[PDB]
């Protein structure tokens, strides 16, 4: 029911995952700023920038991550950004906002120059994870797993990443067997939500593509992380 070595790993991850927060200045904007498309997009840029800042801080602390080759570190970070962000933004939409602010945040996302074709599956993802009442444990481990995926483009040592990833998958699996024994399929279904996460790489690329036609601007970190040049 978790070896002591698995307990340690779980505590390292949760410790690291929890010292990341959405700054108050940004959530305040969700209520206070006017509801124009220009201001909506500006706020999303700030959330995005913050998601990526938070991704990096989480990543740099992942066990074994310093031991990987420097180029691969960067391929992981960039490979994973979209999937990790959408997941985080799901936790935030479901769980780290006061009751009414989902509705407003949603209203802003709905009037920021994103096609319904990307919105529909986004909010369908948010819905489906909320109904699962996904735990903090789950968000955290799932996030670590996405980041340490051996399947990204340009990894020179896929085996070294696989050795960091496997232990995380075993922990999560055992947590499922433990905390949800009446649902033996739970682990598979969380892996199914990872499969659906992978869908957003395509969507996001399309979304960035449409914003760029209307000459919207993005920040240094964001242009860098997604090769927007």
């Amino acid at each position: 029911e978790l070896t002591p070595d698995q307990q340690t790993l779980l505590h390292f991850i949760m410790d690291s995952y929890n010292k990341q927060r959405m700054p108050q200045e940004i959530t305040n904007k969700i209520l206070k700023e006017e509801f124009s498309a220009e201001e909506n997009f500006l706020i999303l840029t700030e959330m995005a920038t913050n998601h990526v800042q938070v991704l990096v801080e989480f990543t740099k602390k992942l066990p074994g991550f310093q031991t990987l080759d420097h180029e691969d570190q960067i391929a992981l970070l960039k490979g994973s950004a979209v999937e990790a962000m959408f997941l985080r933004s799901a936790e935030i939409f479901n769980k780290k906002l006061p009751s009414g602010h989902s509705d407003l945040l949603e209203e802003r996302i709905r009037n920021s120059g994103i096609s319904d074709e990307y919105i529909t599956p986004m909010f369908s993802f948010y819905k489906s994870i909320g109904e699962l009442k996904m735990t903090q444990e789950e968000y955290a481990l799932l996030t670590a797993i996405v980041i340490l995926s051996p399947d990204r483009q340009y990894i020179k040592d896929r085996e070294a990443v696989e050795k960091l990833q496997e232990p995380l998958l075993d922990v999560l699996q055992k947590l499922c067997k433990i905390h949800q024994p009446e649902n033996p399929q739970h682990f598979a279904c969380l892996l199914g939500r990872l499969t659906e996460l992978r869908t957003f790489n395509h969507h996001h690329a399309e979304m960035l593509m449409s914003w760029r036609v209307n000459d919207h601007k993005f920040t240094p970190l964001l242009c860098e992380i997604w090769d927007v040049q």
Binding site: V56, K60, P220, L221
Partner: peptide
């Protein structure tokens, strides 16, 4: 990738 490297090391 000088910016991402910087953020990885600091």
């Amino acid at each position: 990738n000088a910016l991402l490297r910087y953020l990885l090391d600091k």
